[PDB]
Design a protein around this ligand. Structure first.
Ligand SMILES: O=C(O)CCC(=O)C(=O)O
Ligand code: NA
Length: 254
């Protein structure tokens, strides 16, 4: 099964046309969506104006297990109405989400974009000696309580692609002074956010984005002032990250 797939930037992002998201999608469609998700890291569906809270949740169950103050009439749907900092979702926990499904309900006429970065492409572009170092690093992620140690490089459980696991929740690279930690983090994270590794989406009401949280970071642009912006999100449960040597992440505090 071949979806009508339209890449947005050169290294990340694709719009999928001809698909009406719902709880009733067949297996071939769901599988093709999951494949496009892994390949493109963030995928976009426009004109999903029939989708409401319950059907967004029902659609989400087809891709994984939703995780649990929620939108009335639902168990897992959350409203956001700001995250202008580069991050991978909830990495201060051990088994953080594998994906989110985010729908635009009210969209600013100007501003309000979201940007995603491909952390697998960011890893791949490092010179070999720098990949080898990144393969050995561990970082402490925190919500400063919750603290988790994750490998800086995560091997994706479906594709096997290696991806940098960094972003806003990183407190420090384990085993380094603060000064060295800052420099090493600035190098690796700088590759994540390099423009070539990103795609910026301008939202219209009824757009839905789905991203693979295991191989992305994102950033919500806070340039829209008091213009109302309302989005609704379902988050899907993910796995404990595995590093390049097979070691697993571990919570070290609370
Ligand atoms: O509004 C968005 O595009 C995403 C918001 C977000 O990333 C968050 O709350 O963690
Ligand atoms: Na987020």
């Amino acid at each position: 099964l071949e979806l009508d797939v339209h890449p947005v930037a050169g290294r990340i992002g694709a719009e999928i046309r001809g698909v009406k998201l719902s709880p009733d999608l067949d297996a071939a469609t769901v599988e093709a969506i999951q494949a496009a998700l892994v390949r493109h890291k963030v995928i976009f569906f426009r004109g999903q104006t029939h989708l409401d809270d319950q059907s967004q949740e029902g659609f989400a169950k087809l891709l994984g297990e939703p995780v649990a103050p929620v939108v009335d009439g639902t168990r897992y749907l959350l409203q956001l109405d700001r995250a202008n900092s580069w991050h991978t979702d909830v990495t201060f926990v051990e088994a953080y989400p594998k994906a989110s499904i985010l729908r635009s309900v009210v969209a600013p006429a100007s501003g309000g974009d979201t940007v995603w970065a491909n952390t697998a492409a960011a890893y791949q572009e490092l010179p070999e000696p720098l990949r080898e170092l990144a393969d050995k690093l561990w970082a402490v992620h925190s919500n400063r309580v919750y603290e988790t140690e994750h490998p800086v490089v995560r091997v994706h459980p479906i594709s096997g692609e290696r991806a940098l696991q960094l972003g806003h929740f990183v407190k420090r690279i384990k085993g380094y002074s603060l000064a060295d930690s800052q420099h090493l983090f600035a190098v690796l994270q700088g590759h994540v956010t390099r423009l070539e590794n990103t795609v910026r989406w301008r939202w219209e009401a009824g757009d839905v984005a789905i991203w693979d949280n295991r191989a992305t970071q994102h950033y919500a642009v806070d340039d829209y002032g008091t213009q109302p912006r309302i989005v609704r999100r379902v988050t899907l449960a993910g796995e404990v990250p595995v590093g390049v040597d097979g070691q697993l992440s571990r919570t070290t505090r609370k």
